[PDB]
């Protein structure tokens, strides 16, 4: 399986690929080399002075991100919370049981020389800072990282959360307004504050200032789509993680699952730095990136869609994967779940249904297994000469037909194109 | 089969064809003649004067390409990184382990011309220099290499990178101001700087100025589609590079496969000169060019399309090849992969699916083989009188019948015209 | 399309030839890994009679 030759000549030929190896970065590796998350923010100035730069800056659509970050650090500086138990993530002792700390558990550093942005300021601005303005700024990050006209849907979210505080005020321009949010995400330090806010209030959910977390929720598990897909697949099939894993039927998907489930990364932990590995700067290429798990993304979503999911309808269709093989496996899994409903009873009145009697091949040797055991189904499928039965094709036909208005380059579109013949 | 006579006259006719000698040039051959790459930056005017020439030149009608190249040299002159290991390529030592090296560690010379085109300048420009302007100038290579109204996306996202420091700025004219950089890709010095940038930052992926690649990326593997086509065919089928090679069933494809696999061309190397063999001017006719491998291009893409690829849809259809024979070969390969899904158990909990030692191939007289073994399928195919079966023709039909919006002279349009009449 | 030629006779010839290469792909193995397919076992068509070469 190494030496190839052309038959007519009998000469060795070595098959070669351009080969691009770009590896993932686990969160634990960051803290192997550094014990702090640096936040570069130009201090100086004053809360009242920075409030004027921002308030006026937003109204004109030219405010500096440096000013925004400086204001955000000032207004959120005094917010504190008391810990019931010790708080530790990747060896960092954030706090003990008893004592208090603020939102900035990470170590802050001070930015460069004189500020290039010179002016645009409101002199007489009231101390209504902490209340509503930081909510607004952090809320623009969420409105920022959408591209479809769902803007107005999520931009009203912000306004509604600000209305719970004071008078109704919309600040940016209509067409040009969108442009001054897109860069904000691309700022490393704005991005960190967002993640720090989200993490802090995830610990303190019952805190009064928990409303800040509305624009910043979209930071938790950013680029960790692979972990959500695994979760959704458990819920839609109703099988535990263990069982779902035994139903992986392709090598590429198995590789991706072991990459996903590397131990010591605090994935199932309640309050970890992990969910913000991209925003905190712990990773540049996430192991839970959906593009870094192409086969599992396709297999997971395609199976879930055939089991009547709505999330999978619009999921991206990856390139450079085994379309044909991954579908067959995905279809077989979906057919096994959808056929085998197995509905035991849960409540009774002295009158029970004894069930573990009579379970064999109902339609002679043609009948499918009664349950969801992958070994049973592999046996049955290999009896079917390893090609989908006219019943299985009809099952998927029904799962995709009567699906309406599908996007280009999509799981849904693929699925309907493939099965709705 | 050498001599040809006409039966009526017994005379000899000698069939002749016009010579067709346009031989491919390999990256290894260049460094056997010369041990350097000549880059001609004209004068050393001054960074300040040059910055003024291009800022205005861009903003108005046109700027001189000389002025761009001169400025681009000056703007990228001081950028450097430090390497962990030795960086060598085709017998050239760029730097031993631990050196600090610049972008132009690739031999600079001076152009013999008198700088006459010098007109139109903005003396006011200062700090807004290396930060973004070289990126803008580099970007226009990527934007200019498209003729389809897709450059709207490419210019739009080109601006996003500039916004990641100031001050939104769109500089050239919208309609006529597109052709001014459509010529840049034909200046052998400009394309060399582009390749120099991309090769430098492909090594130093962690540099601050790594964003300068959002433009120069289309230089890497330019006219090396034949290598990508092969890799894409591996990833879509799920077969190894060796196994794909064994599924070549045409002679013309083999010659092309032999062509692109020559022992010492640094194909599978991390950071080489090879990918930039056109833009560095190492070759005037690449061996990995789509056009120079017409049969493999056709066969390879067609097989992918039938295996549900979306990239293959719009791939160009070459002239002057065995269409009928290549298509049967491609149909057979695609069919064998689709009918025989990989499907094996990956994880277990004590309960294993045993399967080995199964002899009978489905049916007594004529039945499709269980694996992906070429010889097993060739023997099976001769038993069908070498004429594609109804199920095979149906397999090809289903995969092409749902394709919408197919462009002229593409392989996708061809496929649907043959398998979905 | 030229005129003053024999359309009918040239057509048959053109189709016979195109049919001969279309229905006969002549696929053959090119590369191997210690496992070779030999084509020439027994040369006879599909149907006992009138099965094309």
UniProtKB/Swiss-Prot annotation, chain C:
UniProt protein name: Nucleoprotein
Subcellular location per the Swiss-Prot or TrEMBL entry: Virion; Host cytoplasm
Span of the entire protein shown here: 318 to 370 of 422
Description of how the protein assembles with itself and partners: Homomultimerizes to form the nucleocapsid. Binds to viral genomic RNA; this interaction contributes to the virion assembly. N in the nucleocapsid interacts (via C-terminus) with the P protein (via C-terminus); this interaction allows to package the L polymerase in the virion and positions the polymerase on the template, since P acts as a bridge between N and L. N(0) interacts with the P protein; this interaction prevents the uncontrolled aggregation of N(0). Interacts with the matrix protein (inner layer); this interaction contributes to the virion assembly. Interacts with the L polymerase.
Membrane spanning residue stretches: none
Record family assignment: Belongs to the vesiculovirus nucleocapsid protein family.
Its job: Encapsidates the genome in a ratio of one N per nine ribonucleotides, protecting it from nucleases. The encapsidated genomic RNA is termed the NC and serves as template for transcription and replication. The nucleocapsid is bullet-shaped with the tip containing 8 turns of a conical spiral before reaching the helical cylindrical trunk. Nucleocapsid assembly is concomitant with replication, therefore viral replication depends on the intracellular concentration of free N, termed N(0). All replicative products are resistant to nucleases.
